[PDB]
Amino acid sequence: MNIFEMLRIDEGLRLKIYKDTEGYYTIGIGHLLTKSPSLNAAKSELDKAIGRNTNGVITKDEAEKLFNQDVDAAVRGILRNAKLKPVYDSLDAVRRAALINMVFQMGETGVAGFTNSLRALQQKRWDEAAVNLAKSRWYNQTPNRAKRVITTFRTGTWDAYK
Ligand SMILES: [Cl-]
Ligand SMILES: [Cl-]
């Protein structure tokens, strides 16, 4: 298992514009298009993203290309974030994947704010981190996905995804 596979399971794959868990227009494998309430605005952001008039539909290859960029951007924002990088550098391969998942989902800023959980992860206090991560709007809005990531940090295995 790896990051791609992991996120592919958490986000799914949709080839037409859809609303995410927050009601925002999205496409592909969790590619957010816009927070605006307008489908037209979504369609425009979509064509700009793919470089063609899509009519709000893309192909699988196109979804995968957006995914590749998105995963890459997430890793890179982790590496540039002064709060995130030290954490990521301290972790093993499997837990690094869980930090990337959260960043993909919530954005770097959102993640950099789990101050307390970051500190526990960095100190390798697994159970403490897991408990703290659960006290979040994140866990209350998307509990099954959050439990999966949390278990990942707790155990350092892919068990939650098999
Ligand atoms: Cl260490
Ligand atoms: Cl809470």
Curated annotation (Swiss-Prot):
Effect ascribed to mutating S117V: 50-fold decrease in enzymatic activity
InterPro entries recorded: Endolysin_T4_type (IPR034690), Glyco_hydro_24 (IPR002196), Lysozyme-like_dom_sf (IPR023346), Lysozyme_dom_sf (IPR023347), Phage_lysozyme-like (IPR052619), T4-type_lysozyme (IPR001165)
Catalyzed reaction equations: Hydrolysis of (1->4)-beta-linkages between N-acetylmuramic acid and N-acetyl-D-glucosamine residues in a peptidoglycan and between N-acetyl-D-glucosamine residues in chitodextrins
Protein name: Endolysin
Annotated phenotype, changing D20C: Nearly no effet on specific enzymatic activity
Active-site residues, record numbering mapped to chain: E11, D20
Chain positions recorded as substrate binding sites: L32, F104, S117, N132
